[PDB]
Amino acid sequence: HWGYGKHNGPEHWHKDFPIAKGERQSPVDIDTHTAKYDPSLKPLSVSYDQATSLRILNNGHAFNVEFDDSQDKAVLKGGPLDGTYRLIQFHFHWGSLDGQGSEHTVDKKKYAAELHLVHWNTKYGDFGKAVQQPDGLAVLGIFLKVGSAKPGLQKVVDVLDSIKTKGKSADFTNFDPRGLLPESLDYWTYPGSLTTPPLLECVTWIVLKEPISVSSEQVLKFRKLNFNGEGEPEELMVDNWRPAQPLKNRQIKASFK
Ligand SMILES: O=C(O)c1ccccc1S
């Protein structure tokens, strides 16, 4: 199946998932000079105080931190969004080297990694029905650069050696995703897609301008995970990013002047 290698990576995905060449694929390059301030944007509200994390899973692509989304607990609203979107999971994309790893780029600059906090529109009842809708999902995208450590990341880093291989999971209760947010909520937004198969075109992307800093030691631990399952040859989990796709008939809006 699909992955990030030479023979199954992003340039092959279109064969099984033809929407890979669709009209609102993600990620994209964010040209900061072309992005326009949008005064119709409402203030963004990231309300994560009652978040209930449950588990961390290596899915042979990245690792997912999953949340209990059975009640309105951790939600994203305002900004470009109509209504209330509930956090269901987060994960990252990263590189083999600090010069690459993010999926969005900013004036062609690649960051060392990118965090995606995935939410679904509660008007659609569950995540499965939300991914059949053009406004089913909202993904909050946050860049990571290598510099000072991010303390609120360390609980994630320290659990990784327990989910080294594909199919492994661990308890991951009481993790507070507020510790992953930068100071500013300035952001860019545009309509796009999931960035792994099945590449569904359901996402309002909200990409924060301010990166968070993580330490070289934190990101090195990401790079010690494995794409392979236990008892199989080691293939390090690195470079699990999709590159920027054509912007097509879209405009990137900025929340800031
Ligand atoms: O983030 C993604 O791109 C993704 C892709 C497939 C399934 C779930 C997700 S959340």
Ligand SMILES: [Zn+2]
């Ligand atoms: Zn992602």
